[PDB]
Amino acid sequence: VPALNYP
Amino acid sequence: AFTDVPALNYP
Amino acid sequence: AFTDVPALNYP
Amino acid sequence: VPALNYP
Amino acid sequence: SVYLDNTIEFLRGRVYLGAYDYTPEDTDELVFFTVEDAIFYNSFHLDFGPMNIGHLYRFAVIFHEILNDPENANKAVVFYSSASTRQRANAACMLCCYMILVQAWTPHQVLQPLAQVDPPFMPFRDAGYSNADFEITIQDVVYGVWRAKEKGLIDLHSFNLESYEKYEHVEFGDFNVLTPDFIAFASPQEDHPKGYLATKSSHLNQPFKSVLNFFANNNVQLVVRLNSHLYNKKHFEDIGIQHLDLIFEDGTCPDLSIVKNFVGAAETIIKRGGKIAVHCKAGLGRTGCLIGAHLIYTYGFTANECIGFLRFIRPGMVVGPQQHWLYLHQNDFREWKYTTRISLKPSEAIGGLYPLISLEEYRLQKKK
Amino acid sequence: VYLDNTIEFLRGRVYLGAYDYTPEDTDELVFFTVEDAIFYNSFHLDFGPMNIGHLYRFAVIFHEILNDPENANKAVVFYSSASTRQRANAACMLCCYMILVQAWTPHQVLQPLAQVDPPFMPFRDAGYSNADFEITIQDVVYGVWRAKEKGLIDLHSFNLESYEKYEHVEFGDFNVLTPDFIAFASPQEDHLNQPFKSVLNFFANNNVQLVVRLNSHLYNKKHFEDIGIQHLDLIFEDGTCPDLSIVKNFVGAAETIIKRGGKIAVHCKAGLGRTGCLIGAHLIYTYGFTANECIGFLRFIRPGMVVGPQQHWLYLHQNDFREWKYTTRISLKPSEAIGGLYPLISLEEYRLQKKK
Amino acid sequence: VYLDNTIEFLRGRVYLGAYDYTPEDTDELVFFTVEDAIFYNSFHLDFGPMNIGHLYRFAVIFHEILNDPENANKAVVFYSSASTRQRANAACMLCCYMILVQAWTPHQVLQPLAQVDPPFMPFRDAGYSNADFEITIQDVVYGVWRAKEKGLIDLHSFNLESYEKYEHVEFGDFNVLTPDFIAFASPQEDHLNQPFKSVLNFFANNNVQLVVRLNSHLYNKKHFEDIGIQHLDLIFEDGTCPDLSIVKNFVGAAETIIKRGGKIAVHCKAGLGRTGCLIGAHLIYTYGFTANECIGFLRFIRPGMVVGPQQHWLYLHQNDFREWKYTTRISLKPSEAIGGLYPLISLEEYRLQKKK
Amino acid sequence: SVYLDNTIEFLRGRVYLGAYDYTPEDTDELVFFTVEDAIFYNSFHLDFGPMNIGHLYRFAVIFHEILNDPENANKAVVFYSSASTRQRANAACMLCCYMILVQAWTPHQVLQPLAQVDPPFMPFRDAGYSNADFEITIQDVVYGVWRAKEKGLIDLHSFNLESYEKYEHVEFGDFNVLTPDFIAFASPQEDHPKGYLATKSSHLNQPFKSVLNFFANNNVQLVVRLNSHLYNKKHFEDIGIQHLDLIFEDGTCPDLSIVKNFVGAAETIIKRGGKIAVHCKAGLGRTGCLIGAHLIYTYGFTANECIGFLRFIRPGMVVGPQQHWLYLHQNDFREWKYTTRISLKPSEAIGGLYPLISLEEYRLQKKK
Ligand SMILES: [Ca+2]
Ligand SMILES: [Ca+2]
Ligand SMILES: [Zn+2]
Ligand SMILES: [Zn+2]
């Protein structure tokens, strides 16, 4: 799972 | 509100 | 192409 | 006249 | 009409809704009119609609004077606007509010002609400076205005356009009568002297005197302040009106303990037959949270319906994060009708007034 | 940096486009679309949104492009055609991905999509009459997010193979919506055909303890009782709205089975319209869904539920569904109307049983 | 870098946008629009393009923002509303600026505007009947560029004050199109009113040696002959197309005055329709304009010229206009049909005069 | 129809042009049909249209079989497509070409219903890999197809769809009969041996033999090669066809001296009643420059009309900078009809054939 968390 | 409301009711 | 060309000419 | 010539 | 493009049929042969980037010409069977140049929306920032109740009334008299013109006896009237999605939403929403409030149509009857239209209408956004992240639709506004009419909150026949436009101005108090029970206004400002001059009504400006005069002649019993002190509260207490402070930061969301105290403070004033006047700095953001929560608590509005109804009377209410806050706490507002009840003992938090308590606290009082 | 009709979700990494042509890849850009592979099977004039099975297949393609070493320093652009209907299916499917995989919040995924021109086409029902009710992407996002918070959706436990298998008409045509409910179409009996045999085998191995029939008799209900499953009829006309007395009986019947730890299986003829009313009323009663959130969540699992006038019915009665949590309670005495299960009674009659 | 519905002309310096809202300025972006100040006066259903007077006022605002020291490292974005009609007026006005000021070529200004969605609204005529003929931005750009190459347009010599003054109906309502031709509306005589007196003063000080009347008599033609200007009638019905014999006579009459070094002043009642046919046929005859380029160039100087069926007439006869350069030549004998001027005869009759 | 949106009226009550993102349902007064799923356009790169003459013929038979269905006796037929601007241009342009070629309408009659439509149609672009910088409109194509019919270049009644689709394939020669005088094809390829095997027609592949067989039975007198040598020219000379090389670089524009020699080379072959076959690598770019210049020289096409007519028969002709080149030199092509004439002495540059000379050179020959 790529790290695409909200900034 | 009025005194001249047209009859625009849903058929 | 033809043999059944409808009459769609400009009025 | 600003220099806006095509590259 | 057959050759018309981008036109919606409401009443066949009578009412039509169009959208063109040109001025169409009238025929022997059609008549076109628009109100963009005279009935427009004032934007705080990037909000564009919907049109308020004062816009609908002015639209109704123009619509009626065209319907009953003998020259337009057998013609179909086409109300139109520009081709922009924003201006197509205000025109369609205002036409729906007309059939709701004047022709007694139901929401599913006015929402059918506007469903699955390409291109779709532009949803309404808030009046804040930040980027938009919450939208209400025409379906929300129509249901909100329709529910308010069913509960007796809106009666366009007793509506007075004269005072509605007068008291919305900044130099006259900047307020609107949302419901028969509530009034939303902006914080009055004054330069209170510290001498004998502070005993006469001479340093009070015109919008302050307009608020004091209107409140004294309209059964206003309580004033709730939500922002910092910009005036002296004694001017409201001299005319026999209670003043209460429930101050929290501008743009933020109120704690649920503040909301509960507000509901309890306003419910007894309603039980006494009076009105409550709530204000923050501008009377839009913080005022919309408390009044909107009481409306959901009372009449069961959805969060989207409640926002749409408030803006239909007073544009720009509920700003920014307060929209998602009202959306996520709407269940708690309606829950209080079944988990709480008015207490028999007054509370010092709302100035010797009766608050909300649980069903265990209430029955234990009536027994003892 | 020069594109048109492209929305930014993550700066220099995630983008949402819409073009009527195939864009070329670049040293800093890589484009991909699933319109040609992942599509929505329409009943009539409904076009979306994409279901959970479409979401899973989108995540596999998305993750493969993300971790492709050739795309190490590229920004990925997920695009579709320029139609307002296809732009809504892609935007909503990308939002549900960030909600269920990347743990975003509703206001975070809705910010890039707000006030865009042209706007997205709102979703409609799967009925034949003219549309008069619409749900938005904001409704579906909030519905999918709320369901995840209540533990109703877990993509880690999602089985794509069984989801697609049992959704087919040949395997029974059903979807398990929640850990408590299952919606299917009415089985048919002319031994037993494969769809009926597949339903009996699945219900026996998944703790199904109650089957509720909502349409006319098309089979023998003894086959469910032969394997130890209680059968119950709450039948009303197809396309109509259930009386509130039927809804109250359904809630109490389902709450009794939920207390025991079993599942309830509801069906009309297609398992969409009448089935969505009762199951939708219970979800609003239990977890406090809005009417629009509840419709969007059901269609995200099983497309086409709640049809026509049932949409306005669920909208005008959502307050009564959330009211029963505080005005009623499960009775201590069984009722013959729900086949021996315990119904709903108000607190006045309940506290009387407490001692008496 | 994040904008939508924005076209790039110069990387990081010039951009063309279209929004239904007012965008905010940034440290790297500055936005400006002229829709509220520079607009197109419409005759009926025509909306553009913008004329040369609108171009000049746009260049002053553009240059002021370009050399503003606060915008030293910003990219300028010229935008309009999202309507296809207003997006065409802005894009075409920005293209004509790069042609006449920055010395761009047609294929350079048309590249950013090609294959954009939604496309620009093509320009129509200023008549009352339904439109059946359209010119594009590609036509106007090529027409403005060709006119500049032939020395017909010079923005350095453009006088904005006199251009706006003499275009008004109170000052005579005329525009000098080329160094050889002037198009005006028919003067009216009930002393003499101001518009008639303004036309006589301008013609006497600008080397006007021939006035051609194309409509019914509304004044006394002696006022032009009193100051030494030849008057000529080539009248045909308003809204109709001139016979080719009238066009041939007009070309020979104008070529005679051009040889002497004077100017020709043509007018119908409004100086748009019938006037555009004859002057348009001469421009195609002399410089080889296409029919669409010629219409776009005339409307860029004087909006509304060539109306209705005259557009298709100029399109189907453009080959005959360019043919007269090789099949005819100015006659050595005057003709009574053009008031003593020399008409056009074929080479067969011309080489006979050469000796005889 | 009254309730229809985004629909254009051609023949009132009979013919309509719609555009919807859904499948409309037939009524007792309406019948809808589309041909997107069966009659589509093959793209070299980013070109999307217009539809060629083979697409029009297939559209005509479907249109006629719906018009004469007794079930659709009193209904209005609505030909529609998707809502994309590209697919709305191919549908509208093909419907206009139908009325031009079959119903004998004039351009201003078929262009009136399509004028000032919002949103506008997408203009057609070239078939090159570079960015587009040149567009032709439906007005250009309609005028181009109409002018070709007036000059006898197009006769849909003698049109044979069977051979049109057969000989456009790559494995059958890849050519089209543009006019009764010209043929555009792709360069034949072969592996010419250097022994006794080079005397039998056994190493020639199928598309080469198809070209040789078709040219020998259709009065082809001259073959003009514009690209490098990919085959041996003796195969065309053995069947009595002259071969001539006018080679210039692919994608570039031909010098006017090459264009003049081509016009002169083809004019005498036309004077002898034969056809000329021109080819580059693909027979689109370089072939379109020379054949297009001769068409403008002969019948007075505009540059835009000429490009639209060539692509209506053979899609993808005139690529990239060749579009602006044909546009800026169209005056020189029509000028040659009045400044030049066919010479009486042959020229070695066009293989002992008669070229163009000035009027001073020509009269000096007939005198002497
Ligand atoms: Ca766009
Ligand atoms: Ca439309
Ligand atoms: Zn004071
Ligand atoms: Zn060989």
Residue type (1 letter), F305: M
Please give the single-letter amino acid code of residue F89: N
* Contact yes or no for G109/G92 (Cβ under 8 A): no
Closest Cα to residue E296, out of E96, E128, E147? E147
Residue G353 burial (CB < 10 Å; 0-12/13-18/19+)? exposed
Nearest to H144 by CA among H291, H311, H332, H17: H311
3-state secondary structure (DSSP) of residue G314: helix
Task: Scan for tokens 């649920």, then name that residue.
Answer: E256
The rounded distance, in Å, linking the Cα atoms of H288 and H187 is 14
Contact predicate H140/H305, CB 8 Å: yes
Please say whether the beta carbons of H108 and H143 come within 8 A.
no
Query: In Å, how far are E127, E137, F226, H117 from G31, measured between CA atoms?
Result: 22, 30, 76, 30
Q: Which of G2, G21, G22 to mutate to test the interface with E (most CBs of E within 10 A)?
A: G21
H52 phi-psi bin (left φ>0, alpha ψ -120 to 50, beta other): beta
On chain G, the residues whose CB falls within 8 A of the CB of D6 are 98, 102, 104-105, 108
The length of chain C in residues reads: 11
CB H124, CB H49: distance < 8 Å: yes
Measured distance CA(F281)–CA(G349) in Å, rounded: 98
| 3 state SS of H242 | strand
- Whether there are 3 or more C-beta pairs closer than 8 Å between G and B is no
Kindly tell me the sign of the dihedral angle through the C-alpha atoms of G140, G144, G149, G150: positive
Q: Is the separation of the CB atoms in F150 and F123 below 8 Å?
A: no
* CB pair distance less than 8 Å for C8 and H68: no
How much distance in Å is there from the Cα of E20 to the middle of ligand 2?
10
Identify whether the C-beta of residue G300 lies closer than 8 Å to the C-beta of residue G152: no
Nearest to H241 by CA among H227, H225, H220, H217: H220
Does the bond joining F49 to the residue before it have cis omega, within 30 degrees of 0? yes
The angle formed by the CA atoms of residues F140, F141 and F144, to the nearest 5 degrees, is 80
**How many Cβ atoms sit within 10 Å of the Cβ of residue H347?**
16
Q: Nearest-CA neighbor of G35 among G79, G91, G65?
A: G79
Q: Which helix or strand (DSSP H or E) is residue G10 part of?
A: strand G6-10
Residues 6+ apart with CB under 8 A from H329: H256, H259, H293
Sign of torsion over alpha carbons E105, E107, E111, E112: negative
Beta-carbon contacts of H335 under 8 Å, excluding residues fewer than 6 positions away, are G322, G326
Amino acid at C3: T
Distance from CA of H305 to the nearest CA of G (A): 12
Residue E145's nearest CA partner among E76, E50, E70 is: E50
Q: Is G96 a catalytic residue?
A: no
* Cis status, amide bond into G49, omega within 30 of 0: yes
Q: Are E118 and H83 inside 8 Å of each other by CB?
A: yes
Query: Residues 6 or more apart from H193 whose CB is under 8 A from it?
Result: H203
Helix then strand then coil, in percent of chain G rounded to 5, is: 45, 15, 40
Instruction: Round to whole Å and give the CA distance between F171 and G221.
Output: 96
Nearest CA to H119 out of G59, E6, G45 is that of E6
Strand partners, H363: none
H220 vs H277: CA distance, rounded Å:
7
G314, G291 in Cβ contact below 8 A?
yes
- Residue F51 to residue F28: CA distance in whole angstroms: 31
Q: CA-to-CA distance for F204 and C5, rounded, in angstroms?
A: 66
Q: How far apart are CA G335 and CA G234, in angstroms?
A: 14
Q: CA of E146: how far to CAs of E121, E330, F2, in Å?
A: 20, 19, 46
3-state secondary structure chain F: CCCCCEEEEECCCEEEEECCCCCCCCCCEEEECCCCCCCCCCCCCCCCCCCHHHHHHHHHHHHHHHCCHHHCCCEEEEEECCCHHHHHHHHHHHHHHHHHCCCCCHHHHHCCCCCCCCCCCCECCCCCCCCCCCECHHHHHHHHHHHHHCCCCCHHHCCHHHHHHHHCHHHCCEEECCCCEEEEECCCCCCCCHHHHHHHHHHHCCCEEEEEECCCCCCCCHHHHHCCCEEEECCCCCCCCCCHHHHHHHHHHHHHHHHHCCEEEEEECCCCHHHHHHHHHHHHHHHCCCHHHHHHHHHHHCCCCCCCHHHHHHHHCHHHHHHHHHHEEECCCCCHHHCCCCCEEEHHHHHHHHHC
Q: Is H23 on the interface with E (CB under 8 A)?
A: no
Residues of chain A with C-beta less than 8 angstroms from the C-beta of F108:
6
Q: Can the peptide bond before residue H315 be classed as cis, meaning omega within 30 degrees of 0?
A: no
Residue G59 one-letter amino acid: A
Query: Any idea what the Cα angle at residue G347 is, between residues G343 and G350, rounded to 5°?
Result: 65
Q: Is G44 exposed, middle or buried (0-12, 13-18, 19+ CB in 10 A)?
A: middle
Q: F328-330 and F344-346: which strand pairing?
A: antiparallel
For residues G215 and G267, is the Cβ–Cβ distance under 8 A?
A: yes
In terms of residues, how long is chain E? 368
Q: Would you list the DSSP string of E207-225?
A: HHHHHHHHHHTTTEEEEEE
Which experimental technique did the depositors report for determining this structure?
A: X-ray
Q: How far apart are CA G299 and CA H263, in angstroms?
A: 37
And the tokens for E254?
Answer: 């109120």
The amino acid occupying position F347 is: L
CA distances from residue E267 to E239, E334, E336, E337, G75 in whole angstroms, order as listed: 22, 14, 12, 12, 57
Rounded to 5 degrees, φ, ψ at E297 are: -60, -35
Count of all residues that appear for chain H in the document: 368
Find the helix packing angle between G244-260 and G318-327, rounded to 10°: 50
Long-range pairs for F200-204: beta carbons < 8 A, 24 or more residues apart: F200/F224, F200/F227, F202/F166, F202/F172, F202/F174, F203/F227, F203/F229, F203/F265, F204/F229
Q: How far apart are CA H1 and CA F245, in angstroms?
A: 46
Burial class, G4, CB count within 10 angstroms (exposed 0-12 / middle 13-18 / buried 19+): middle
Give the DSSP H or E segment for E182. Answer: strand E182-186
Per DSSP, the three-state class of G123 is strand
Counting one residue from chain B and one from chain E, the pairs whose CB atoms sit within 8 A come to: 27
> Which pair of tokens denotes residue F51?
């279901």
Q: In what order do the strands lie in the sheet with H7-9?
A: H7-9, H15-19, H76-81, H30-33
**Residue E330 contacts residue E338 (beta carbons within 8 Å):** no
Helix (H, G, I), strand (E, B) or coil at H295: helix
CA of G263 to the centre of ligand 3 (A): 79
Amino acid letter, residue F344: L
Give which of F118, F175, F145 is closest to F301, Cα–Cα: F175
How far apart are the C-alpha atoms of G300 and G50, rounded to whole Å? 7
Contact E269, E215 (CB under 8 A): no
d(CA F220, CA G56): 86
Cβ of F20 and H86 within 8 Å?
Answer: yes
Q: Please state, in angstroms and rounded to a whole number, the distance separating the CA atoms of residues E210 and E171.
A: 9
CA-based nearest distance E14→chain H, Å: 13
- Give ∠ CA E267-E273-E276 in degrees, rounded to 5: 60
Taking a C-beta distance cutoff of 8 angstroms, is the pair F181, F211 a contact? Answer: no
Closest residue by Cα to residue H274 from H318, H342, H220: H220
Write phi, then psi, for H15 (nearest 5 degrees): -120, 135
Tell me chain G's radius of gyration from C-alpha atoms: 22
Neighbouring CB atoms inside 10 A of E71's CB total 8
Cα angle F286, F95, F91; round to 5:
125
- Of G92, G268, G277, G294, the active-site residue reads G268
The Cα E258–Cα E265 span in angstroms is: 10
**E strand or H helix that includes residue E148:** helix E138-150
What does the DSSP 8-state code read for residue H11?
S
Write down all domains in chain F, each with its CATH number in brackets: 6-150 (3.90.190.10), 155-355 (3.90.190.10)
> What is the C-alpha separation between F52 and F56, in angstroms, rounded?
6
* CB of G172 closer than 8 Å to CB of G199: yes
Residue H198 DSSP label: G
Question: How far apart are alpha carbons F205 and H58 in whole angstroms?
Answer: 57
**H helical segments located in G79-134:** 84-100, 106-110
Q: Which residues of E161-176 are buried (b: 16+ CB within 10 A; e: fewer)?
A: eeebeebbeeebbbbb
Distance in angstroms (rounded) separating the CA atoms of residues F9 and F114: 12
Phi-psi region of F124 (alpha: psi -120 to 50; beta: other; left: phi over 0): beta
Say whether residue H237 is in contact with chain G using an 8 A CB cutoff.
no
| Whole-number Cα distances in Å, E341 to E356, E358, G58, G212, H253 | 5, 6, 68, 94, 89
Q: How far apart, in whole angstroms, are the C-alpha atoms of residue H78 and residue H30? A: 7
Which residues, at least 6 apart from G275, have a Cβ–Cβ distance to it below 8 Å? G183, G214, G266, G267, G268, G305
| d(C-alpha E106, C-alpha E99), whole Å | 8
**Cα dihedral sign, E27-E30-E31-E33:** negative
Nearest chain H alpha carbon to G146: H328
Cβ contact, residue pair H84, F85, below 8 Å: no
The count of other CB atoms within 10 Å of the CB of residue H345 is 9
Beta bridge partners of G213: G233, G267
Q: Which residue has the tokens 């909000």?
A: E47
Residues of E in contact with F115 (CB under 8 A): 46, 122-123, 125, 132, 135
What CA–CA distance (Å, rounded) separates F82 from H338? 51
Q: Which residues of F touch H82 (CB under 8 A)?
A: 83
Cβ-in-10-Å burial (0-12, 13-18, 19+) of H307 comes to: buried
CB-based burial label for E200 (10 Å; 0-12, 13-18, 19+): exposed
Q: Which of H97, H99, H98, H80 is nearest to H36 (CA)?
A: H80
F33 exposure class (CB count in 10 Å sphere: 0-12, 13-18, 19+): buried
Resolution in angstroms, to 1 decimal, for this deposition?
A: 2.5
How far is H155 from F336, CA to CA, in rounded Å? Answer: 83
Instruction: Test H21 with F81 for CB contact under 8 angstroms.
Output: no
Q: What does each C-alpha distance from G141 to F270, G100, G276 come to in angstroms?
A: 61, 10, 19
Q: Are F79 and F89 in contact (CB under 8 A)?
A: no
The rounded distance, in Å, linking the Cα atoms of E11 and E135 is 29
Strands (E), chain H: 7-9, 15-19, 30-33, 76-81, 175-176, 182-186, 220-225, 242-245, 275-280, 340-342, 356-358
Measured between beta carbons, which residues in chain G are less than 8 angstroms from residue F6? 4
Chains E and H touch each other (3 or more Cβ pairs < 8 A): yes
**Residues E227, E229, E231, E237: what is their CA dihedral angle, to the nearest 10 degrees?**
90
CA-to-CA distance for F351 and F345, rounded, in angstroms? 10
Identify the helix (H) or strand (E) that includes residue G141: helix G137-149
Ligand (nearest to CA of H4): 2
Asked if residues F80 and F90 have their Cβ atoms less than 8 Å apart, the reply is: yes
Contacts of E275 (CB under 8 A, 6+ apart): E180, E181, E182, E183, E218, E219, E220, E221, E269
**Other CB atoms closer than 10 Å to residue E132's CB: what's the count?**
20
* Residues in a beta bridge with H15: H77
Cα(H267)–Cα(H261) distance, rounded to whole angstroms? 10
G83 in contact with chain F, both atoms CB, cutoff 8 A: no
Other Cβ atoms within 10 Å of G82 Cβ, number: 20
CA distances from F32 to A4, F23, F37 (A): 18, 9, 11
Say if CB G89 and CB G113 are below 8 A apart. Answer: no
Look at phi and psi of residue F334 and say left if phi exceeds 0, alpha if psi is from -120 to 50, else beta: beta
Of G82, H263, H337, E338, nearest in space to F117 by CA: G82
Q: What is the residue whose two structure tokens read 């070493």?
A: F69
If residue H110 lies in a helix (H) or strand (E), which one and from where to where?
helix H107-110
Matching residue, tokens 């079944």: E338
Angle ∠(F120,H21,F276) on CA atoms, nearest 5: 65
Give the residues across from H242 on adjacent strands. H222
Contact G83/E82, CB-based, under 8 Å? yes
Query: CA E348 to CA E35: how far, in whole Å?
Result: 52
Q: Which residues sit opposite H175 in a β-bridge?
A: H185
Cβ within 8 Å of residue F163, ≥6 positions away:
F52, F53, F56, F175
